[PDB]
Amino acid sequence: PHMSVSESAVFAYESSVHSTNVLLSLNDQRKKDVLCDVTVLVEGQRFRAHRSVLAACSSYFHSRIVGQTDAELTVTLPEEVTVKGFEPLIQFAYTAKLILSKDNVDEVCRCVEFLSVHNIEESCFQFLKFKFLDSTS
Amino acid sequence: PHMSVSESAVFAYESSVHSTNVLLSLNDQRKKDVLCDVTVLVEGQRFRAHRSVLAACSSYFHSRIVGQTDAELTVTLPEEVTVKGFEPLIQFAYTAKLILSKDNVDEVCRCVEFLSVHNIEESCFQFLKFKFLDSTS
């Protein structure tokens, strides 16, 4: 026949992969420009995104976004923000992974500070402790 | 002085908590009705959400949402969907945790199937193998 359990019992199911799947679906939506709702303009280049996600990940975006009413909102970032710095940064927001090398560490980390991208302040602090010189005592 | 690293080296940072934080920020946005963009109507009750998230988590929502143009989109679910079933279900989508007991298991799991809420089909299959009777041989 079947199995049974105490009448008052409560079942629970916690997925360890769900939140990551959701984030990756949003990243896929972002790369395809489907179901997005905001455009971020950096040096003439357009980055599509979800204002909800951007507000959640950056205090700067949060204040620029919250009371906005435009279905087709555009947020223009000043010169302090560059395509070279912002690119890997929005990629982090949507993938949880932040990549850096000699040529972008400074700009990527200046943007992190300038936009206050939460889960990354520390990392940048650590990466900025190095100089890409090539150990040759 | 400082530390250095090979000129060609590449730094990477993977956050294990970021995707969960993002999901919880979206859930907070959903409970407060701030930065949401879609309303789901179930038996006269309104559930605010992010169409991006709903499309990502449910095939049914995905087809009802994608080509929509309404900034203020409303998706009405038929009688098969009930507040008792849907409630813990949208909560799962936004928290990764699905709770169930004797009184909602059937409706919550009928909705999961009806809406095709990805990361939950199996769980429901397992929970439906039980009867809440109270083991008293």
Final resolution, Å: 2.5
What residues does each domain of chain A span?
Answer: 7-137
A14-39 CB burial, b ≥16 within 10 A, e <16:
ebeebbbbbbbbbbebbeeeebbbbb
CB contact set of A132 (below 8 Å; sequence gap of 6+): A101, A102, A105, B4, B5, B6, B7, B8, B9
* A19/B contact by beta carbon, under 8 A: yes
Domain A7-137 bears CATH identifier 3.30.70.20: no
Tell if the CB–CB gap between B135 and A55 is shorter than 8 Å.
Answer: no
Tell if the CB–CB gap between A53 and B11 is shorter than 8 Å.
Answer: no
CB contact set of B106 (below 8 Å; sequence gap of 6+): B85, B128
Residue A121: count of CB within 10 angstroms of its CB: 12
Residue B78: count of CB within 10 angstroms of its CB: 7
Tell if the CB–CB gap between B57 and A7 is shorter than 8 Å.
Answer: no
CB contact set of B110 (below 8 Å; sequence gap of 6+): B80, B85
* B50/A contact by beta carbon, under 8 A: yes
For residue B41, what are the β-bridge partners? B46, B76
Instruction: Select the residue of B7, B18, B53 nearest A132 (Cβ to Cβ).
Output: B7
Q: What is the largest CA-CA distance in chain A?
A: 75
